[PDB]
Symmetry: D2
Subunit: 431 residues, 4 copies
């Protein structure tokens, strides 16, 4: 008979997400078995800290040797929840060498080594899945890879890092400085003691790289992504943006341009009318533009215990279904297809077109005349200017090639009348 | 070799969506073949009007006999785009009898005859899919059935009829009467000459029934759905709701309650802060609450040529993959599972708990005293009242059993001081 | 010749206003002499503290004996700037006994002893003037007594205490508690160490009494004025009033009612659209309703050095003109006319009609039913109610006789479900 | 005895104001007699149309010969209500030649011939008064001449034409074009069939000239006043001003500048926070800045039957008091003093400093560069710019000498890229 042999799952790492995963599998067992066609049974977890893992494990057998999982011939699927590059990279490659599928939440590993991992998986005939790696419990990979298969994806924009969104939301709502919002976030447990990956846009850029690979059918190319974080943003910027009709978000943009693909993470002004502009707190959202369907939006929690577990288990079900149905690979199994890739190049940030919020400090009437002539020389059109013995002057530009703005900014900063730098923050309509 | 035999598709009906489907299949052929594992090839379309179909067909062979499609042994998948109950019901059943899969956009047929259709499909071992039947190009069925498989769904709320949303959006923005917004919508082609299914909530209730079946694993039970449309709504109501902090939408709610399932379509006040409250024009959105993932939202176009085609083709790909991989049914194929159903009863509207906007016309100081005593007698708590020789009095109630409100309203309407009826409109926080 | 003999002025008290007066007389000497028809020359000031007075006097002779001023046969006009009741009352009466005119800023003295003072002045044939006693530099007495002589005054409403207005403005703008706004005001010198007369409405009620005497031609009847201050007002009250469409001001109202005259000072909600509702900081405004002219408004500073001096000097000019023109009293000289008085009674507060903001704390659905029945029993109509295990409930009533509200409040406070008192604050449309 | 001989008054013209005057004198007879010291008795009215005058006269004797009034030896005071220049000028001069006082509402006559009229009045020893000529029932002349006598007036700004304010209020509230607001105003009787004096700022400039004479002690110099009306103002202008934080009013400004006096009427942007900016409908307001008192504001109706009558009667009382007290002129009687005048010159508009709203239509990025260089060349500083194949560009300038703006505008209009003219509207903070 079919449906009587359980599929056997092993975990690498446990933690919050692992504990969540065990809880979700047990609690929803009935529905999971129904959809999967057989029971999904967790056999053991390899963990570094045995004592801390006990509280989260609910009596699941634990071991400190990860090869008790990746080399156990009885284990069919490995769930990788270690995070980091090593030893996750080594264990994942070994799991694959042994003919095991891998379900992972590891956006860092997948963004950096996805090409080599998927290539090795396809050669071996196993699946590696990563729904839980991007936007938490939001089924965005399934939406992109399966829901929107009939679409050419023109672009997507995402709020996909909860901590940096929480900070930017709090700054706007409360009016406080970045520094003390970051400190308050750490105290209340919204930001970790070392928040570099969050506030510098690195986490978001890992995830965007993955989204870009699946949206456009290209290799993972994290090194080529432009990233800028939020730490240089001031109270004034948030307030001026508000008065000008915009919200500020840390956005990942992946977009087909004329001569390449944009892959960029940066603070960006979004008109306040847009739904994505009003996605606050620790919530995530991905806005996707397909040629047939138009803009579609997926919104929810992008991190946290049970939301992440939800995506891990969905991947467990998907992998289980295809493992059982199709061991001879009559149909493609991998969401990332090494034999179906396009070589479209990623654009440098300077080759990308965008609009700008510009804020500078200057000392005369001739000051504006020089600034505007510099802008015209670089073919930059102004949408608005506001001047709120030095005055703060704010400029909103039309859409323009970034190289132009770089060159123009250097001339403006060369003006005797200009002390300090020109703070740039990019602006995207998304309409 | 695998992948060399095309799957052969036949259409019933063509129209806007059919033309769209042919265009999308041709334009995205490369990606579709990649994901499906073989070419998906449309062989012919059965159409009623040969001349009108010519302009939309792009040279695809046409026939006026639908059995040239459903009885042709070479056709593997039938795409049903007729709409209506008959002859769609008969042709669909015959397609199934002949061992063909069916991809349909027909929410009316699926909501009314889904139980018998899926039962017949499971017995035969074929698939019937209906992604295009609910929320157009938004992959909500895939999200509910596959993305959220690890979740118990607690409730969902949807804006899933584009025309009724367009009218309610226009009324709010422009301040005009329902009558002339409806007329203006018909003139500009946003509403059809007979808009009954749209403005009466029937279309939305077809779709909600389908959503409820997949969310909760229950039979289709359209007859048991509560439905109320928008035609009784006044300019005053939209304006008062705005001043009170709410937007008015035609919402479908499907929810697990204490003793049953709520299945209801009605105008409803939603706090203006909610994302779903700001979903305007012809856009659709479904807000889904799962136990593991929390609230997630799916937003986009819910009708139109290419959005609908997008969902049809996604279903074509899904069906093709499983047809090829798993003809022996090692795993479940149907999104609706006749052998896995729960018998949880649908609640009558009166057994449902909700909050209310109440507006009535009355003539004395004792008038309010009597009204409030009547409410207390039926255990109804007031949140707010506003009195904007007859005065219009507006009441917002706390959450309460509908039976209570029915009885209290009848006593209020019996008061000598009260001329006319008490206009009720329901209120849902969704937070 | 005319115009060659200076009129000789003596001061009682100096201080800020006195110093201001000397400065204004000197600086505008040309215009003052032109209008007066002769020079106005300050001869000396009687002061208590000789050293502190030196800095403000600009070399004007000083004496510590006030009879060097009020008994000097050469002095024609006494300017009384002592404040307080004694010795101002005694010196003023002695100045009058000696046939000298008196210009005073002393609202306390005039409100309490105006009847006896003006009677003594008319018998003697001298003038006592008090422009500087009410609303500082705003020429409201001249406007009421001379500008609006062709009008029956129906009512006036005034913001006439700068300190209490500053506090209420700050509370609204900044959201802070009364306590710390009062403390911050004292630290920055907007409120004096003992602010009783300001925050309790006593100063405003002195001034309103004076305004009422001139508006309606009645005796001064300060004892019969209703007064309530601001110290019981909470942050919640200011915020709720804001959300409901109102601003809160400490208002003096003097009004002809059906059976009497209203004379009342209290916190009051004024619709936010009204100009007087937006009179903030330390500014004063008096809104006057005449039968011929309609509503007229006079706005400006209501205290401070030079604004007060401005009014003192205007009075000096008026007195000088009539002293010179008309020593035989062919025309009336006094602004308050003891031989032309009406005996219209002042209403007790309970006999006055007004609308109310009511805020109470209560524990059930029957709670509102009981409250509303109590209100109907006392013939009180509700405009609005808002309910923002105890809940805060807010009621706006229609216009009603105060006695009714007193009785109804006592029944509401007797309800078991009601803990604490019902905070009342009155509400006036002024439209 | 004093007080037994009535003063005898004759009218020239009757109309709305005349009828009002008779009604007010009769209705308030008690108070008027009290303050005046004797009865004020209207003997007859000279009118052009006997039949139309009957309805307004209440049985007062009427005659068509105005010399039955101005040559009747028994008449002490003439009330001139004809309007226009002739025959009012001739009759007024004849009244003066005959030793009669004149009370007038005729702002046109007083603004144009005030110098010659007051000179003739002072020589004869009679009074000419004109309270009713400016700002209707608001006692602004009394406030300026008597209330603020201790002040050097630095500047005043007035909304003093009801019709032009009604139009500008309606345009802002309703969003309609000037043309149809003007037409609708004429239909509802807010604007007369020939509205030239109202919409062109002529009426306001008559009144401002009078205000300027009394504020600054200078001759009437109407010919030297700058005037601009409202008819060139567009819907866009009102809306852009609103979005930028301003209201648009037709303002009269009289101000002491460095080298002269500003005397100007024009549309002007006032920040929306100012009380005067929110003075809407047919209401008038004069904002007065004195050195001692600071800014003071007088608000009310500036036209209409009984408001105007109110001011006429106040003048009747003033004239009566001084006629009785002081026939030997011990003190000055005239509000305008021909023997006390300063020769300070009126500035041409081009010699005046003000800020600007500038709106122009233009076609390139170099367009803004040229505009800003032109502005810098004329020493003009920009506060803000907004750009809402031609684009509308809006500029707010800092305060600058008008000559500079004229020259800069001519260069901007010379740019090939600029089609049409630069619409200027002036901007005044008034803070």
């Amino acid at each position: 008979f079919q449906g009587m042999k359980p599929i056997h799952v092993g975990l690498l790492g446990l933690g919050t997400v692992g504990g969540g995963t065990l809880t979700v599998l047990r609690r929803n067992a009935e529905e999971i078995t129904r959809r999967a066609g057989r029971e999904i049974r967790v056999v053991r977890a390899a963990v570094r800290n045995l004592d801390k893992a006990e509280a989260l494990a609910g009596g699941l057998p634990l071991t400190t040797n990860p090869f008790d999982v990746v080399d156990d011939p009885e284990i069919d699927i490995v769930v990788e929840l270690i995070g980091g590059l090593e030893p996750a990279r080594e264990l994942v490659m070994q799991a694959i060498a042994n003919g095991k599928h891998v379900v992972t939440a590891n956006k860092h590993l997948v963004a950096k080594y996805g090409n080599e991992i998927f290539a090795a998986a396809q050669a071996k005939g196993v699946m590696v899945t990563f729904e839980a790696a991007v936007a938490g419990g939001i089924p965005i990979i399934k939406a992109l890879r399966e829901g929107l298969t009939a679409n050419r994806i023109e672009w997507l924009a995402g709020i996909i890092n909860g901590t940096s969104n929480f900070i930017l939301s709090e700054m706007r709502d409360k009016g406080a400085a970045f520094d003390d919002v970051l400190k308050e976030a750490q105290r209340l447990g919204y930001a970790e003691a070392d928040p570099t990956f969050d506030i510098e846009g690195i986490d978001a850029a890992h995830k965007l790289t993955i989204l870009s690979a699946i949206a456009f059918g290209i290799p993972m190319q994290f090194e080529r992504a432009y990233t800028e974080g939020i730490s240089q943003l001031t109270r004034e910027d948030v307030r001026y943006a508000e008065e000008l009709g915009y919200r500020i978000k840390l956005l990942g943009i992946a977009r087909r341009a004329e001569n390449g693909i944009e892959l960029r993470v940066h603070p960006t002004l979004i008109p306040e009318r847009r739904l994505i502009a009003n996605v606050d707190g620790a919530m995530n959202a991905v806005l996707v533009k397909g040629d047939a369907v138009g803009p579609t939006l997926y919104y929810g929690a992008g991190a946290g215990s049970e939301p992440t577990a939800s995506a891990v288990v969905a991947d467990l079900v998907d992998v289980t279904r295809l493992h059982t149905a199709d061991p001879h690979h009559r149909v493609p199994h991998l969401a990332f297809q090494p034999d179906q890739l396009a070589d479209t190049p990623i654009l440098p940030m300077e080759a990308v077109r965008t609009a700008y919020y510009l804020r500078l400090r200057a000392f005369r009437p001739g000051v504006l005349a020089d600034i505007t002539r510099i802008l015209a020389d670089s073919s930059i059109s102004i949408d608005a200017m506001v001047q709120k013995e030095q005055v703060d002057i704010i400029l909103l530009t039309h859409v323009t090639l970034e190289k132009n703005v770089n060159a123009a900014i250097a001339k403006i900063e060369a003006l005797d009348a200009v002390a300090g730098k020109v703070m740039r923050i990019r602006l995207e309509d998304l309409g």
